[PDB]
Write a protein that binds this ligand. Sequence first.
Ligand SMILES: CNc1nccc(-c2cccnc2Oc2cc(C(=O)Nc3cc(C(F)(F)F)ccc3N3CCOCC3)ccc2C)n1
Length: 252
Amino acid sequence: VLKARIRMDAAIKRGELEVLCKLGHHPNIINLLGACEHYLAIEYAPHGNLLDFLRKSRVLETDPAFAIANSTASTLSSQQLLHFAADVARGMDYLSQKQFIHRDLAARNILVGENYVAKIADFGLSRVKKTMGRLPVRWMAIESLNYSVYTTNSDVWSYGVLLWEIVSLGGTPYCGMTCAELYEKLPQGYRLEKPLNCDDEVYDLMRQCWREKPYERPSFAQILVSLNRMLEERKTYVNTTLYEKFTYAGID
Ligand SMILES: CNc1nccc(-c2cccnc2Oc2cc(C(=O)Nc3cc(C(F)(F)F)ccc3N3CCOCC3)ccc2C)n1
């Protein structure tokens, strides 16, 4: 994958053209510009992947003097954070009505484009039982861990974890927990805990994505509605201000 001019900025990769074309276009997915050879051209995202971008906003760690002085934990606001969330949901709604199943929803696979508009991507390398590489276990629905099932509802569970990645600023999900104990504890109804900077209502939405029953989970259309409600309220939903006992959700 290489940076290039000709839209100007593009990320060029050198059978996949059928899949990209059939996705059509949407402001919340990657944009297929054109192709040929002697080479797939996609619109470059100046802010790179969401994970790294969420982590680079941890200003206390990067620029502590600046952070303390401003009483800020993040260069992103609750408005920006929730807009990333609504961006992914809008793209996943678009993508799921075309019966596209991602199977790898996580911050690492979302791009931050022009105007900080989040875009679904897939950095795997080719596209009814479905194909799987190495399992992203911390992002996986109970029913994928057991049974190896993949549907829009399992995508919704992974979205729940991405929503958690957004609020925690790139925290590693279940920090301190082994992959093995997830297979064991999730069936028993264990779920990820509410982050400290998180409002109860964003936590409820995450919990809705993690219902045991796949068919009880909300649709991406319903998830966008919930988030839009939060963004329209005066209420701040994600705390980004420092306080005496502040600690970031752990990364490693
Ligand atoms: C850092 N900035 C940046 N901007 C744009 C792209 C990239 C980037 C970085 C590293 C690797 N790849 C890219 O960009 C992509 C991204 C994709 C990509 O996301 N492709 C697919 C996306 C989707 C989506 F989920 F969005 F609907 C679905 C299928 C996709 N591909 C999957 C691979 O095979 C063809 C179809 C394909 C090619 C390239 C060159 N980086």
